[PDB]
Design a protein around this ligand. Structure first.
Ligand SMILES: *[C@H](O)[C@H](C[C@@H]1CCNC1=O)NC(=O)[C@H](CC(C)C)NC(=O)OCC(C)(C)Sc1ccccc1
Ligand SMILES: *[C@H](O)[C@H](C[C@@H]1CCNC1=O)NC(=O)[C@H](CC(C)C)NC(=O)OCC(C)(C)Sc1ccccc1
Lengths: 301, 300
């Protein structure tokens, strides 16, 4: 009874533009009078094999950047590089700018991606940041500069800007200050995703969701300490819990009356014993890409 | 990778408004100077058990309808009813009205849903019209009047307006002419759907998606005729595959070098032997809510 739901994308659609240098076009994000985009737009395909970004940029001027909203050019009046993002000052404040902030998310957190090509949105879908700092997205050539976001009340929190596709078909990128998630660098040289793990806090959220819906055969009579649970979980390639994880499970723990550590003890028994052919929420697989906020957002509205 | 992907919802967000009658509140769709919404907004709790809608509606006045676009009330200057949809004429045009049309979709087709509450957009996701004319949505109290749609070029094709949830947790609603998909009625009584089936052409498209993304453990060296495949399909409550379906799958067959009927032979083996605890594109079940067009677009 659960599905990945994206946030409504309109507030972000109103911020997408295209940025071109020479023949390289990608997407940018226009907020107030600044356009944010991946810095590799300044690279020729041959530069991308081995770029010196400081030296490539010092040779650029405002008049080398073509920024367009649709087919309408936005004149660039300044430029600077902040980590792996380029910031282009433009002479028009975007009238569709929403209330916004820039946030750096943690593994396990989910967000919506608005996949764009040539400044035009094509589709929206929900992603989770994996513990290895990749996302399992859907991106083609020309998608760089597409962004990921959450919407809280009136306010768009941008958390991801897209830069790269790894050999295993997963994706990597930066926050809006240009800092990559994970060890990746914006160079066209062989790179690989590390070994991934299961997002424990989200599996627990999923078990809480099952309980809310009356599916609770897996609740046991025991508890555990956080440290004992973390040490066991790692033997099953599950992530250890942080204090922040315990706290973000607070609302679901209060809603169900099941202490976080009792649920941990139930999960430990599932890991140690298996499902024994039973299902939870209709599935024999434990889901790890629904956060506690996602569960609340779909169970209680 | 390969994700369930919805259309960007902005063009539809600019059309959602809130409609209240009495203590009943739901969403409407504001296009030009008309607001469309489910007619059961005019019902009280008592009315919903057995509503004579023409009789209930004649007793309403324009001023009984409170329409709000954000923090602005829109004055209703006229109303009519078209099947299960109420059309409220308002004194102001929506400047955010997109290019649009109203279409009635076929079972197996997919669309995006913009789930809304009190006229405010809440989430967007992809659904398919099931063969039994339900949809597996995520809708709560206050979601009625949320709409489903596709976007082609700049044109929004509205295909679904939400009205109800069935005891099994699936959903039912109408096209924008107010006619239900399926044998359902907008009355507060328990209703069951016909036996559902699996959308075979969509399962095949998703198998081809799994191969494009380098996952082909399920393939085999065998083949099958169209009719022999269909005999097995129907036995497992899968929809029949037509020659038009085979034709529609051509691009995906060309892209991958796997003849359609060879992929049919693969699916036959999956149906007869199961997945042996294995997974395809992360799923432990055969997914049937991607169309061939959906797969092609997201891989092109
Ligand atoms: C920007 O639009 C583009 C998005 C990619 C293209 C296809 N799908 C995507 O998500 N980004 C890139 O092409 C990126 C640019 C550099 C970071 C400057 N290159 C890239 O992602 O290459 C990946 C490698 C070379 C780092 S790893 C790899 C992947 C496949 C095969 C071999 C090696
Ligand atoms: C409109 O916002 C509302 C949407 C529903 C609410 C919960 N999820 C939805 O999708 N629509 C209705 O509540 C609808 C109004 C009638 C058409 C007049 N009623 C409705 O959907 O009720 C279904 C039931 C309760 C009659 S079927 C059932 C379900 C569980 C147990 C027993 C019977």
């Amino acid at each position: 009874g659960f599905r990945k739901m994206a946030f409504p994308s309109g507030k972000v659609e109103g911020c997408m533009v295209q940025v071109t240098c020479g023949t390289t076009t990608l997407n940018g994000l226009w907020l107030d009078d600044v356009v944010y985009c991946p810095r590799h737009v300044i690279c020729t395909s041959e530069d991308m094999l081995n770029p010196n970004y400081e030296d490539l940029l010092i040779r650029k001027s405002n008049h080398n950047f073509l920024v367009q909203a649709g087919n309408v050019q936005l004149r660039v009046i300044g430029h600077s590089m902040q980590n792996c993002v380029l910031k282009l000052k433009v002479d028009t404040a975007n009238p569709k700018t929403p209330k916004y902030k820039f946030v750096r998310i943690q593994p396990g957190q989910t967000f919506s991606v608005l996949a764009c090509y040539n400044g035009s949105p094509s589709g929206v879908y929900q992603c989770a940041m994996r513990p290895n700092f990749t996302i399992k997205g859907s991106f083609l050539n020309g998608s760089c500069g597409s962004v990921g976001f959450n919407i809280d009340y009136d306010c768009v929190s941008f958390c991801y800007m897209h830069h790269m596709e790894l050999p295993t078909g997963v994706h990597a990128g930066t926050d809006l200050e240009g800092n990559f998630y994970g060890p990746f660098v914006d160079r066209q040289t062989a790179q690989a995703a590390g070994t991934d793990t299961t997002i424990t806090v989200n599996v627990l959220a999923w078990l809480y969701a099952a309980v809310i819906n009356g599916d609770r055969w897996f609740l046991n009579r025991f508890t555990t300490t956080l440290n004992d649970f973390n040490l066991v979980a790692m033997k099953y390639n599950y992530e250890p819990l942080t204090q922040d994880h315990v706290d973000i499970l607070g609302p679901l723990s209060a809603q169900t009356g099941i202490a976080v550590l009792d649920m941990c003890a139930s999960l430990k028994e599932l890991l140690q014993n298996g499902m024994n052919g039973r299902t939870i929420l209709g599935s024999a697989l434990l889901e790890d890409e629904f956060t506690p906020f996602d569960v609340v957002r779909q169970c209680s509205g």
